[PDB]
Amino acid sequence: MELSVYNIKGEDTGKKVVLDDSIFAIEPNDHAIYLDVKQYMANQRQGTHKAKERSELSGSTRKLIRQKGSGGARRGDINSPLLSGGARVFGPRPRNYSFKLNKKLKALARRSALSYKAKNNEIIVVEDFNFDAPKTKAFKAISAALKVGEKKVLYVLPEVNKNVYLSARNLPNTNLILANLINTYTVLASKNLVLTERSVAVVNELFKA
Amino acid sequence: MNLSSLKPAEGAVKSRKRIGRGPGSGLGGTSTRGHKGAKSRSGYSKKIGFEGGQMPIQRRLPKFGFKNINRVEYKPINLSVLQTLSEASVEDLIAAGVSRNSLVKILANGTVTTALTVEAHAFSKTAEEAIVRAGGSVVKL
Amino acid sequence: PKLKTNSGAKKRFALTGTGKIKRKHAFKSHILTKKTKKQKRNLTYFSTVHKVDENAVKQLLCLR
Amino acid sequence: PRSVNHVASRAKRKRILKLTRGYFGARKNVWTVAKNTWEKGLTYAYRDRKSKKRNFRALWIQRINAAARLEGMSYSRLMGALHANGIEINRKVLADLAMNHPEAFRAIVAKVKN
RNA sequence: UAUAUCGGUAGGGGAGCAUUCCAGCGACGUAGAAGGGAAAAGGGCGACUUUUUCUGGAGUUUCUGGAAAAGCAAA
RNA sequence: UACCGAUGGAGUGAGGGCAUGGGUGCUAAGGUCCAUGUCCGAGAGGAGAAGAAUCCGGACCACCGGCUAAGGUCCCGAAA
RNA sequence: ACUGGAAAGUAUGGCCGAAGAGCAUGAAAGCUGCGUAUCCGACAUAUCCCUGAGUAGCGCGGGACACGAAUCCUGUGUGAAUGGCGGGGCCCAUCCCGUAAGGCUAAAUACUCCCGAGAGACCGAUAGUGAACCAGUACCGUGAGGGAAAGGUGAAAAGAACCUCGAACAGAGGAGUGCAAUAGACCCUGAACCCGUCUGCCUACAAGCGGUAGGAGCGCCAGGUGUGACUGCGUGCCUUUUGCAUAAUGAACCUACGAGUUACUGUUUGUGGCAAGGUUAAUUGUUAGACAAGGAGCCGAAGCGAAAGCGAGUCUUAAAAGGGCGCCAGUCACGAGCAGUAGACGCGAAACCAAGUGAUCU
RNA sequence: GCGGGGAACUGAAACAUCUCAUUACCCGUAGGAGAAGAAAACAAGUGAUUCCCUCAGUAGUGGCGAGCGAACGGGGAU
RNA sequence: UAAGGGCAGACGGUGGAUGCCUAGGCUCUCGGAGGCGAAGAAGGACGUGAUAAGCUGCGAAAAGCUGCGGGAAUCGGCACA
Numbered sequence A: 001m002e003l004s005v006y007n008i009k010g011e012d013t014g015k016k017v018v019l020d021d022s023i024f025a026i027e028p029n030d031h032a033i034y035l036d037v038k039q040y041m042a043n044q045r046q047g048t049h050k051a052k053e054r055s056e057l058s059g060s061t062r063k064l065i066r067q068k069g070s071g072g073a074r075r076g077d078i079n080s081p082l083l084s085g086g087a088r089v090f091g092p093r094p095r096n097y098s099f100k101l102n103k104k105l106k107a108l109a110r111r112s113a114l115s116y117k118a119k120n121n122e123i124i125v126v127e128d129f130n131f132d133a134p135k136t137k138a139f140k141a142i143s144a145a146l147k148v149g150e151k152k153v154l155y156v157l158p159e160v161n162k163n164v165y166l167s168a169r170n171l172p173n174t175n176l177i178l179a180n181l182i183n184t185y186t187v188l189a190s191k192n193l194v195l196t197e198r199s200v201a202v203v204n205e206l207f208k209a
Numbered sequence B: 001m002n003l004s005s006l007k008p009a010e011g012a013v014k015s016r017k018r019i020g021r022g023p024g025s026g027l028g029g030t031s032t033r034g035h036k037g038a039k040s041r042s043g044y045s046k047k048i049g050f051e052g053g054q055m056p057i058q059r060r061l062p063k064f065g066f067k068n069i070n071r072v073e074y075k076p077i078n079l080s081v082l083q084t085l086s087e088a089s090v091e092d093l094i095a096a097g098v099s100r101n102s103l104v105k106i107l108a109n110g111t112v113t114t115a116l117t118v119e120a121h122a123f124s125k126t127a128e129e130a131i132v133r134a135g136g137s138v139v140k141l
Numbered sequence C: 001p002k003l004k005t006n007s008g009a010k011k012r013f014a015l016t017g018t019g020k021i022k023r024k025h026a027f028k029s030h031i032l033t034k035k036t037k038k039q040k041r042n043l044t045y046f047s048t049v050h051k052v053d054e055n056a057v058k059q060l061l062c063l064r
Numbered sequence D: 001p002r003s004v005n006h007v008a009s010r011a012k013r014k015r016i017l018k019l020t021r022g023y024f025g026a027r028k029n030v031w032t033v034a035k036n037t038w039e040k041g042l043t044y045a046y047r048d049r050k051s052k053k054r055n056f057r058a059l060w061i062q063r064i065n066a067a068a069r070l071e072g073m074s075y076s077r078l079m080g081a082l083h084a085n086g087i088e089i090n091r092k093v094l095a096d097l098a099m100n101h102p103e104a105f106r107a108i109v110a111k112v113k114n
Numbered sequence E: 001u002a003u004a005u006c007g008g009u010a011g012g013g014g015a016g017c018a019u020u021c022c023a024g025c026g027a028c029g030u031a032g033a034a035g036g037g038a039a040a041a042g043g044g045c046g047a048c049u050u051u052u053u054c055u056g057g058a059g060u061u062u063c064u065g066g067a068a069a070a071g072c073a074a075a
Numbered sequence F: 001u002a003c004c005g006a007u008g009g010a011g012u013g014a015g016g017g018c019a020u021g022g023g024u025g026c027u028a029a030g031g032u033c034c035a036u037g038u039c040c041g042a043g044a045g046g047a048g049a050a051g052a053a054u055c056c057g058g059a060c061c062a063c064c065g066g067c068u069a070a071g072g073u074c075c076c077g078a079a080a
Numbered sequence G: 001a002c003u004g005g006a007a008a009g010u011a012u013g014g015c016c017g018a019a020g021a022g023c024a025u026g027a028a029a030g031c032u033g034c035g036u037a038u039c040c041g042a043c044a045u046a047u048c049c050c051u052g053a054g055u056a057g058c059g060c061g062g063g064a065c066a067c068g069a070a071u072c073c074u075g076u077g078u079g080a081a082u083g084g085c086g087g088g089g090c091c092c093a094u095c096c097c098g099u100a101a102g103g104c105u106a107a108a109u110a111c112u113c114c115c116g117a118g119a120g121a122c123c124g125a126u127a128g129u130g131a132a133c134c135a136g137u138a139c140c141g142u143g144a145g146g147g148a149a150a151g152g153u154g155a156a157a158a159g160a161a162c163c164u165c166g167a168a169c170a171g172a173g174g175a176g177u178g179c180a181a182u183a184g185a186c187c188c189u190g191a192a193c194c195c196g197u198c199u200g201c202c203u204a205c206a207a208g209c210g211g212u213a214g215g216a217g218c219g220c221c222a223g224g225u226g227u228g229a230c231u232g233c234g235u236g237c238c239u240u241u242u243g244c245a246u247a248a249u250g251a252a253c254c255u256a257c258g259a260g261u262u263a264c265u266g267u268u269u270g271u272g273g274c275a276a277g278g279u280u281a282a283u284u285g286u287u288a289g290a291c292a293a294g295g296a297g298c299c300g301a302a303g304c305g306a307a308a309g310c311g312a313g314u315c316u317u318a319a320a321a322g323g324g325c326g327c328c329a330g331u332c333a334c335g336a337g338c339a340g341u342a343g344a345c346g347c348g349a350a351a352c353c354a355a356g357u358g359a360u361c362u
Numbered sequence H: 001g002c003g004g005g006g007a008a009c010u011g012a013a014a015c016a017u018c019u020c021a022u023u024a025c026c027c028g029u030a031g032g033a034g035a036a037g038a039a040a041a042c043a044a045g046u047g048a049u050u051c052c053c054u055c056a057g058u059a060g061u062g063g064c065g066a067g068c069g070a071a072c073g074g075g076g077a078u
Numbered sequence I: 001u002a003a004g005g006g007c008a009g010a011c012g013g014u015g016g017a018u019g020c021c022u023a024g025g026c027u028c029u030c031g032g033a034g035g036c037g038a039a040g041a042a043g044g045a046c047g048u049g050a051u052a053a054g055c056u057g058c059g060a061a062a063a064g065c066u067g068c069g070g071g072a073a074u075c076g077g078c079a080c081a
């Protein structure tokens, strides 16, 4: 596809970039997007949860009552789950929730998300910019000029740009990401996607086909 | 779709079976186990190769044969795939485009019908006759 | 843990090309003057595992 | 996470116990006793929905028998005559006429009195 | 659209409801949240769900997907 | 109208009554062991006063409609 | 400005942002407080010719090695060589490799009583540690040892001056405080079982699981609601059984608690990605889980034969298709079912073994 | 961590070889780690130890039962 | 005529469920550190406050003594003085 380029003042610059068709104009795979999103949210998990089973309780293993003759239910030791304060049966155990997805499946899901953004027309290509000093107001003005300051936005940068990151840190509906670390969840989680020219070049080079 | 309207493919996810949770489910009470006996108890396990005390088949039958340690087994390659690789050269034995540092034996199932010099660890007599008839050569090394 | 093969089964059974189990007939080791020559040759030949004994032989060979 | 459905579990019992009001003693409010009583009642209700049709037909037949004997016939003779003449008025309507519209019942009887 | 079929134990198969928490999207709340009492209505059917009012005095919830310490009448 | 191949999941491997053909027993047993059907098991409804398998009959739900089965029609109790 | 007891709420209108983390504040605060981003800061005191002899080897009895008698070890008895000597799964010869009977050695590895800083699709007072509080306390036992229950007034004690009944706050009725005292000290909410009072209807000629289906009269508030004269039908439930109203088992009742879970490895299947190929593991780089690398390995791609081996053939045979087996789309995942190994659906023995405590009874 | 002693219930659908297990337990004794470590080695070319992924439930072992179970090689950390 | 009883509603009693709440647990991550003791340890006994000490701290100098650095208006530990 072809996208016009805006400066940081919100005005069309007359320059145009070409987005790779094999990235931005493919038929999206909804099942692939589902799988990639699920894997991302599973990898974020820290499954630190546990309860005490019978072998891990603190009571002694002594038979509480004699087997026959007392006239009540037969009883073993005090750690039984039938007793109040007894064992937790089949409670949680520490777990690792990561699983495997094929690399080609992940690439397909990434391209499906990008194609979906392009088809629904939320991709804005902007000129590369730098800040001499960190300043939240300047980044806010850039977002307002690009008309992305209402809903969630994701800016994609070609490199670190520490001053820009510091400027965008405090804004609540703004996310930043490097071009080479683009993933399906992050692309889909934001309403608007903003790319720079160098970011477009990097994405086209690195995620094609 | 976005994160708010995710949908798996139809029939991709299925709910698990949960037993011992009431009459309406069809899986409560005895919870699919039947009534009594060994198989109804917690911790029952099947003894593999056990038939109730009758001498099992894996003891009734006799042991046979032996396995050679230094068995030289070749990977078979046929004339049909030789000709397929030839039709996009005349000098085979590249074979990485397969194997991975293996011994290759050329066998005769299809037909070469070309003029190729093939290097391989082994050939069959039929394969040699076929390649020479089509006008080829062998390098058995 | 991974499944363990039964040692006796791995010494007594073998896989054929189309996923059949090869076995040897078992009545011929030490009482052979009394038996019949055709009987002995039919016990010499290599047989296959019956379908009802399959999946039990497979469980012994770790479903391989 | 830990899940205990306290409110739903209690609400199920409360909904059923609203249905056992009016029962005698512990059968109205004690829950295991009350729930036991309510299900046996449901089996009774299924059976009695079937029995109600037989009961009402028997009542209609008895009223028709009395009115026919007042007119000079018996129930079996009257119904045979009606069926022979092809009159399709059912026993519910005939009993209603016998109880409340004796002139109409009389004209019906006079139609087949031949 | 028709025809046929629809008693069920062991048992096999299918489709759903509620519960706790999470992500995304929407919402509600001192002009009264959750919980507790009473009343009314609803559902091919049901698990259950809405609404009104009193008490209560601070949190709760819809839809889509995800994960389980995910449902008691007898031991 | 659902019989075979191959595959995934089973449960069952304490049966019982009746009729028929028999063994055993005493041509006893609501006895016991086989065979052929059937029903209860796992089956509600109707008659038989009340009865697991005798006689009639296989319950998707509702109906204050109708016809019948076995068996009945003096009253309890529907119909001479 | 509005509501409110009280704004941090809602509606306006402003400002800061390298600070929109959080906690507290009379309800939910970027701009009220402590903080947060960022920058600055230490008088000390700490930290950074020779070549290994009771040997090598050997007998007997044993042990450890994956191995239940090669290599290694030795209780008992013996016992060399100095180019020589040892090993290559038992012994011999050749070949190859090494040089015992002396010693030291960082890293990559294992762990958490303790300290600092963090986190959770972990619990939330019968849960989570036995222990949120008086906790290894109370209590029990000669002793070793066993081992609990127990959180919540209110924003703020403003924790009720004073009056009345009464011997007394024993308790209550007031007044007053407070948004609220039916928040009054056992104090948020305040369910069930269980216990009462009032009002409506029924009930002292009546006989069985207590309901269910009909159905007057009476009583409340406009077709609803309470009761129920009288009539038909009806031997609870669970479990175990050929078969249970059974005089077979089981439960006083209520609330709360209580039982197919997870990991790994297989197998089948639903749905997917790539496809004659499919897939990475451990690990590494960048920035900080993501992205990229990493092809070792595994499966498929040719079978037959015990095997040498031959190959769309092959085995059997002197030879014959006479006979057997074969020729004539996979792989990696996600979800689910099932299996095995783990305590493996839960509760329950009589016992066995190890280390201790007891002769204050007898 | 190293060392000295060392069970049984259990599995084998009985049980004695075997298993449970060189586990529980008792005892002795270090350090921030300890042990190991520089070939009288593996193999049929590599080149000290240690740890991870494979090789592989393979070779073997076994009342050849139940079971037990390597190494060479290759890829890494160092 | 209801001695008493039955059912329903309302309102109370008991009891402490439920909802909401909590730094008290549980599982981990990263970085340190990995001992104390004859210069007398761990763990205790008895003391110590203006007023009895249940905890806490401390040791006949006994909820504390001295110096240096930091800080700037309250402080005299907790169990509603």
Ligand SMILES: [K+]
Pocket (backbone or CB within 6 Å): B029
């Ligand atoms: K049951």
Ligand SMILES: [K+]
Pocket (backbone or CB within 6 Å): B053
């Ligand atoms: K036997």
Ligand SMILES: [K+]
Pocket (backbone or CB within 6 Å): none
């Ligand atoms: K909640």
Ligand SMILES: [K+]
Pocket (backbone or CB within 6 Å): none
């Ligand atoms: K029989």
Ligand SMILES: [K+]
Pocket (backbone or CB within 6 Å): G183, G188
């Ligand atoms: K209050």
Ligand SMILES: [K+]
Pocket (backbone or CB within 6 Å): G188
């Ligand atoms: K409050």
Ligand SMILES: [K+]
Pocket (backbone or CB within 6 Å): G190
């Ligand atoms: K109350």
Ligand SMILES: [K+]
Pocket (backbone or CB within 6 Å): none
């Ligand atoms: K009644």
Ligand SMILES: [K+]
Pocket (backbone or CB within 6 Å): none
């Ligand atoms: K008894």
Ligand SMILES: [Mg+2]
Pocket (backbone or CB within 6 Å): A061, A062
């Ligand atoms: Mg014990």
Ligand SMILES: [Mg+2]
Pocket (backbone or CB within 6 Å): A052, A085, A086, A087, A088
């Ligand atoms: Mg517990």
Ligand SMILES: [Mg+2]
Pocket (backbone or CB within 6 Å): A090
């Ligand atoms: Mg569970």
Ligand SMILES: [Mg+2]
Pocket (backbone or CB within 6 Å): B026, E011
């Ligand atoms: Mg069933």
Ligand SMILES: [Mg+2]
Pocket (backbone or CB within 6 Å): B033, B034, B035, B036, B037, B039, B040
């Ligand atoms: Mg069974």
Ligand SMILES: [Mg+2]
Pocket (backbone or CB within 6 Å): B035
């Ligand atoms: Mg049972």
Ligand SMILES: [Mg+2]
Pocket (backbone or CB within 6 Å): B035, B036
């Ligand atoms: Mg049985």
